[PDB]
């Protein structure tokens, strides 16, 4: 569920509607000045809130995936998702911290199917 929400937010940020909204704001940028500046403040606040929500969802999804992999062996195939949420978010310090603390307790053989992708 956390991954679904995170992917929804990411897809919205990658959508063409977001680009159209940003382009409309920039076109409005170039007593309209006060209103344009106010709307720029508003959309900056919205962008910061969206980024915070994305970070929270990503962290929750990563930690729950690690816990699921630690719990049992029936869902080992989901390890591909975990690395996919890590290799694409190497900049985020929380993901690296969660990996370093907990993912080193995961049995190593579960990482064998994607060993080619880690080494690269």
């Amino acid at each position: 569920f956390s991954d679904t929400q995170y992917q929804r937010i990411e897809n919205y940020m990658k959508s063409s509607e977001f680009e159209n909204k940003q382009a409309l704001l920039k076109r409005a940028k170039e007593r309209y000045t006060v209103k344009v500046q106010r709307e720029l403040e508003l959309d900056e606040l919205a962008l910061r809130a969206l980024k915070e929500d994305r970070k929270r969802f990503l962290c929750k999804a990563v930690e729950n995936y690690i816990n699921c992999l630690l719990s049992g062996e029936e869902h080992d195939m989901w390890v591909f998702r975990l690395c996919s949420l890590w290799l694409e978010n190497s900049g985020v310090s929380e993901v690296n911290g969660m990996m370093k603390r907990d993912g080193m307790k995961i049995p190593t053989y579960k990482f064998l199917p994607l060993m080619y992708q880690l080494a690269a």
């Binding site: 897809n11 409309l24 309209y32 403040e41 508003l42 809130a49």
Partner: protein, 239 residues
């Protein structure tokens, strides 16, 4: 409800929280909704004293709301505030006016609209004790089945319209600034057509949904308090 908050008080409370965080907006909206209860159910009560006529008018109102909601969602109708919707005093049916904003151009506004249609507390309260669980949901499902079964014709009509040279449907900064005041074209047209084609099928957020599932998703998005708290105060979410 003389003891509740007045409309002016609710408007003032919601306008002063615009430049704040989302949790503060949400808590202010919830507090306003706590002290502002729907009273629309009396509309049919004081105009039709005969129980049979009252039942008929209430059913007609519910069916009109369902049909208008589904059709407006399909066409991406926006700017559905209290002054743009009329109710007939004889048939108790809704009429929609001021249809300038359509095809989801309301989501490009600086304060985007995050609801498919207007399903606020007064609208649901006007439906009876059951709410949106009886006639409303079934009528919405029937209308959506009709729309899905005739998708090719709808795409054809919208394709004919969107390429009309004199139809100015795209949002521009001047219109955006005028709409919200407080006291390449080919790519856009193709994307709008793609979104409409996705709508007329079950593809929501990339997954195929049935008519019932799509109706449930639309209803739960329309009445979601977090969605309602984030809209423009002029839309009057608490009403």
């Amino acid at each position: 409800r003389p003891n509740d908050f007045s409309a002016f008080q609710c408007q003032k409370k919601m306008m002063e929280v615009q430049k704040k965080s989302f949790e503060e907006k949400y808590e202010v909206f919830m507090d306003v909704c706590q002290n502002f209860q729907p009273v629309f159910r009396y509309f049919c009560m004081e105009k039709f004293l005969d129980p049979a006529i009252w039942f008929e008018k209430r059913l007609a109102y519910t069916r009109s709301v369902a049909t208008s909601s589904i059709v407006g969602y399909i066409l991406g109708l926006g700017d559905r505030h209290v002054q743009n919707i009329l109710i007939n005093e004889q048939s108790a049916e809704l009429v929609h006016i001021d249809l300038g904003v359509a095809f989801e151009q309301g989501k490009i506004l600086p304060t985007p609209e995050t609801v498919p249609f207007r399903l606020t507390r007064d609208i649901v309260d006007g439906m009876g004790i059951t709410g949106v669980e009886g006639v409303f949901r079934r009528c919405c499902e029937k209308t959506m089945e009709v729309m899905r079964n005739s998708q090719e014709t709808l795409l054809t009509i919208v394709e004919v319209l969107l390429y009309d040279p004199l139809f100015d449907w795209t949002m521009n900064p001047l219109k955006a600034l005028y709409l919200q005041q407080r006291p390449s074209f080919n790519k856009v047209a193709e994307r709008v057509l793609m979104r409409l084609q996705e709508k007329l099928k079950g593809v929501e957020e990339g997954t195929v949904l049935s008519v019932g599932g799509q109706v449930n998703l639309l209803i739960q998005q329309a009445i979601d308090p977090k969605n309602l708290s984030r809209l423009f105060p002029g839309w009057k979410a608490w009403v």
